[PDB]
Amino acid sequence: GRIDTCPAGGGXXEQXGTCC
């Protein structure tokens, strides 16, 4: 889930996974 699309990225917003 989390970090899945936003690895090492706490702010997985539009950057990827997270919420992107």
Q: What count of other Cβ atoms lies within 10 Å of the Cβ of residue 12?
A: 19
For residues 9 and 20, give the distance between their C-alpha atoms in angstroms, rounded to a whole number.
12
Going 11 to 1 to 15 to 6, the CA torsion angle's sign is positive
Question: What is the C-alpha end-to-end distance of the chain, expressed in Å?
Answer: 12
Contact 12, 1 (CB under 8 A): no
